[PDB]
Design a protein around this ligand. Structure first.
Ligand SMILES: Nc1nc2c(ncn2[C@@H]2O[C@H](COP(=O)(O)OP(=O)(O)OP(=O)(O)O)[C@@H](O)[C@H]2O)c(=O)[nH]1
Ligand SMILES: CN[C@@H]1CCc2c(ccc(O)c2O)[C@H]1O
Lengths: 50, 241, 283, 332
């Protein structure tokens, strides 16, 4: 009753290929890797916790 | 400026001094947990202990020590994922209605006693509760005596091991109890201990009692068992025995 | 070549004491989970053993080997006071450990409130003060003199070392140092054994059907390893002062050195907790 | 009806299988590895009487709040290591905490089935409201603004509250097991929920209805978090595996698992750039993963007991981990 009606809503949705999503995630990571203090260690002269 | 940090360092001192006072109270109190199946008489027991002096909790004092007894919250029958929180309590109080062998709590489930054994087996063989002792309250003794005294609905109908069982030699009977009643009581008690003693590695033990939830001084029994639990823990830690 | 062989034997007795007590000192301070109320007494005992094994034994070994003393008439008294202080402070810690074990087992509910960090620190300071009072003050005041030509010549010479005392000081030092803690420890351990026996009997009565040498061995390792090594020295110390030349000196030194070797045994008797073993394996 | 439900379920599997062009590993095969990452403890906060089950940072990334089952709720200043507040609690069983985006309020909850809100900027900090409509314990609390809070309880339900009136604006249903975590979107319009029935959903705050369901795991779910982009999320289950899902592709992308690890997972979190996936564990330490390669790149093993919470500052400068030994630690 309730379950059969709910599954119909999620059955018909728009989907894209895995390749596009992977490319988008990789591009975002590559673009924002510069401003990551955990990845590239910050100099000791600009470390609040040091 | 530097004056801001001067006031901040003073704020810590006032706060850190209050925590020292809370060290004494927290370290000098004991916490107990009540467990059992439905309609087992848990609230009746705590009601009697209340007069002596969400979730249901009660605080009382015996001699000079502090005790803190709280219920499990009275939640529905379920998988217990909150049981991991109570991994440092002093002891676990288990209440079981032994006078409910010929009863069903769905309608096609096993008799309520077998449901109590199933719950006890799961609690005893728990990864988190590997160092917590259990105090057993074989509650509702008067009804069980009345059921056995009247001739009907024998134990052998539901538990076929009653015929092959006999009264233990080291089993002191009660003065008012008849031989037909003393045998019935000990059969249920040994049934619960068989699960406990089988998988025990010496870290935790089980303490059985025969109690009536309304007119029995249970307060001394809990206090004495708690003293033994602490004493045994120290002896094991010091390598002796 | 008695010296060449002995040198090594005394030498092992020096390295082992210093190395053995080094692990206990570092492990307790470095790890936060090992800093408990009871561990303070163990730390104090380890410090005392370290001081003794570092200062006393090497000088005695040098005196025994070189067959002469070189420092003079001041370092001799300093070394004597140091060894008396280290011996007296080592024994009295064991009595405190026995007492706090007795308090923990006999009275479980009041044990948490009875002992705290301040009380433990005060007790340790008082024990150290009592130990120091009987070592430096009586020697420096020169209250342990002797009345015969040999002692007078010994104190006149600047190259000879020997221990001469009168009856009163020896008796007082022995009573203060060894005899008083022994009776307390014996009574405490007897009471603890009685409590353990009662608890085991209760356990057996509760669930005997479906289901004490451990206590015997645990108490024996603690008691015998101390008594059988330290009683002979004190009995001969009391005997030889009240009697005239009933025993040779070599026996006196030999019975004295057993007390020094006891410091090696102590960290094996204690510090057997699984946490200690894990820390030692890691480090 | 039963036959119709089974037929509809096959459509979802058929459509998902058609869109699987290639795995994520082959696409990022040529990416140079990050290498070995090592961190050193910078601070250690003490003053908690018992185990710690909650933690949350602030927007300024300087002050944080921690909750313990001793009946206390302490606010720290990690720069100088000085306690600022200590709020006593009516109930000693606390399983969650939160910190308002504006910094004026702090939330709490636990086995008492009641959420509580305290007013920091009054001293005499006291309870402001008590949102008491639930059955079963609470698992997580999050703040949308100064007047909206989302809570997930243990009765397979989630609700959106209203602090001013203390009433439920809307409720979400559909789970068959206890809900254990949630995480708001960066724009605070969508959120997820990891239940104990080995599934996750994607609710809508305005509509109050589910949109998608992911069932890639095989046991209970204990943690969840979003990718900084907002189009992906990672899950940490009772088994040793962590999985990364994608909303647009509606499929599981990549799994992080090791043969040696056989314990559970209690918390997960990402990095500032969404490149590292730090996950806690039950074997007394924490691990650092790689989002695009599933290669371990360091172990944080300075804890003497299991790790129960984990968080990363908004500016991505430090990682704070709590445990059951009542000690917090700041890594950099
Ligand atoms: N005859 C008799 N009945 C008892 C006794 N103790 C408890 N009961 C029964 O217990 C009932 C009271 O219910 P509670 O004790 O509150 O049961 P409960 O606390 O809800 O236990 P849970 O359902 O597990 O939460 C009474 O109606 C009694 O019939 C007893 O000693 N003698
Ligand atoms: C140099 N050897 C001394 C001599 C006597 C003596 C010692 C230790 C404790 C005492 O109470 C003593 O009386 C020994 O360490």
């Amino acid at each position: 009753r309730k379950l059969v009606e709910q599954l119909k809503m999620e059955a018909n949705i728009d989907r894209i290929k895995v390749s596009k999503a992977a490319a988008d995630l990789m591009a975002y990571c590559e673009a924002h890797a510069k401003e990551d203090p955990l990845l590239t260690p910050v100099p000791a002269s600009e470390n609040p916790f040091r | 400026q530097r004056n801001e940090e001067k006031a901040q360092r003073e704020a810590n001192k006032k706060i850190e001094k209050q925590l020292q006072k809370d060290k004494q109270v927290y370290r000098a109190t004991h916490r107990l947990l009540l467990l059992g199946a439905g309609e087992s008489g848990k609230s009746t027991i705590v009601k009697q202990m209340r007069i002596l002096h969400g979730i249901f909790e009660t605080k009382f004092q015996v001699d000079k020590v502090n005790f803190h007894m709280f219920d499990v919250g009275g939640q529905r029958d379920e998988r217990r994922k909150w049981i991991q929180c109570f991994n440092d309590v002093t002891a676990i109080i288990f209440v079981v209605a032994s006078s409910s062998y010929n009863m069903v709590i769905e309608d096609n489930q096993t008799n309520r006693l077998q449901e109590a054994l199933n719950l006890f087996k799961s609690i005893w063989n728990n990864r988190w509760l590997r160092t917590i002792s259990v105090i057993l309250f074989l509650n509702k003794q008067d009804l069980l005596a009345e059921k056995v005294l009247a001739g009907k609905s024998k134990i052998e109908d539901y538990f076929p091991e009653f015929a092959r069982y006999t009264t233990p030699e080291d089993a002191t009977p009660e003065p008012g109890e008849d031989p037909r009643v003393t045998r019935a009581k000990y059969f249920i008690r040994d049934e619960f201990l068989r699960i406990s003693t089988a998988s025990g590695d010496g870290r935790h033990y089980c303490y059985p009692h025969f109690t009536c939830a309304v007119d029995t001084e249970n307060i001394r029994r809990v206090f004495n068992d708690c003293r033994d639990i602490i004493q045994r823990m120290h002896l094991r830690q010091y390598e002796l025995l | 070549v008695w010296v060449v062989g002995m040198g090594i034997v005394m030498s092992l007795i020096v390295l082992a004491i210093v190395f053995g007590n080094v692990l206990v000192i570092t492990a307790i301070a470095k790890f936060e989970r090992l800093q408990t109320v009871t561990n303070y007494f163990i730390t104090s005992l380890a410090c005392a053993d370290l001081v003794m094994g570092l200062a006393v034994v090497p000088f005695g070994a040098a005196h025994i080997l070189t067959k002469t003393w070189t420092f003079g008439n001041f370092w001799c008294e300093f070394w004597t006071s140091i060894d008396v202080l280290c011996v007296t402070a080592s024994i009295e810690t064991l009595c405190v450990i026995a007492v706090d074990r007795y308090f923990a087992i006999t009275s479980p509910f009041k044990y948490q409130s009875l002992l705290t960090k301040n009380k433990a620190r005060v007790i340790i300071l008082m024990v150290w003060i009592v130990s120091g009072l009987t070592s430096f003050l009586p020697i420096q005041m020169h209250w342990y003199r002797a009345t015969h030509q040999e002692a007078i010549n010994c104190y006149a010479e600047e190259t000879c070392c020997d221990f001469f005392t009168n009856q009163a000081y020896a008796i007082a030092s022995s009573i203060v140092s060894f005899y008083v803690p022994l009776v307390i420890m014996v009574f405490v351990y007897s009471r603890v054994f009685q409590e353990a026996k009662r608890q085991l009997q209760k356990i057996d009565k509760s669930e005997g059907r479906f289901h004490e040498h451990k206590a015997l061995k645990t108490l024996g390792i603690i008691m015998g390893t101390f008594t059988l090594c330290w009683l002979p020295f004190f009995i001969v110390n009391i005997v030889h002062v009240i009697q005239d030349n009933l025993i040779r000196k070599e026996v006196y030194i030999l019975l004295n050195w057993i007390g020094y070797v006891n410091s090696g045994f102590n960290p094996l008797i204690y510090c057997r907790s699984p946490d200690f073993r894990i820390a030692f394996q890691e480090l | 009806l039963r036959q119709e439900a089974e037929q509809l379920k096959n459509q979802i599997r058929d459509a998902r299988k058609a869109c699987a062009d290639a795995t994520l590993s082959q696409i990022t095969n040529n990416i140079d590895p990050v290498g070995r990452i090592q961190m050193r403890t910078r601070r250690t906060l003490r003053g908690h009487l018992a185990k710690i089950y909650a933690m949350h940072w602030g927007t300024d990334s300087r002050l944080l709040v921690s909750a313990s089952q001793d009946g206390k709720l302490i606010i720290w200043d990690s720069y100088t290591t000085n306690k600022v507040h200590a709020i006593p609690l009516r109930s000693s069983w606390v399983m969650t905490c939160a910190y308002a985006p504006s910094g004026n309020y702090v939330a709490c909850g636990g086995l008492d089935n009641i959420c509580s809100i305290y007013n920091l900027k009054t001293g005499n900090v006291r309870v402001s409201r008590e949102l008491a409509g639930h059955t079963g314990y609470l698992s997580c609390c999050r703040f949308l603004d100064d007047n909206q809070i989302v809570t997930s309880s243990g009765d397979t339900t989630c609700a959106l509250w209203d602090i001013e009136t203390g009433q439920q604006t809307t409720t979400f249903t559909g789970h068959t097991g206890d809900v254990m975590s949630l995480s708001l979107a960066p724009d605070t319009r969508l959120f997820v929920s990891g239940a104990c029935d080995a599934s996750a959903k994607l609710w809508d705050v305005r509509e109050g209805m589910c949109r998608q369901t992911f069932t890639g795991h095989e046991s209970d779910i204990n943690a969840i978090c979003f990718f900084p982009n907002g189009n992906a999320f990672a899950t940490g289950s009772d088994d040793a595996t962590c999985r990364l899902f994608d909303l647009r592709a509606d499929q599981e992308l990549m799994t992080y698992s090791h043969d040696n690890i056989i314990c559970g997972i209690t918390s997960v979190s990402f990095s500032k750039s969404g490149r590292l996936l730090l996950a806690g564990y039950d074997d007394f330490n924490c691990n650092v993963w790689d989002a695009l390669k599933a290669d371990r790149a360091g172990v944080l093993a300075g804890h003497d007991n299991r790790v129960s919470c984990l968080g990363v500052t908004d500016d991505g400068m430090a990682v704070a981990t709590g445990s059951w030994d009542s000690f917090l630690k700041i890594w950099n």
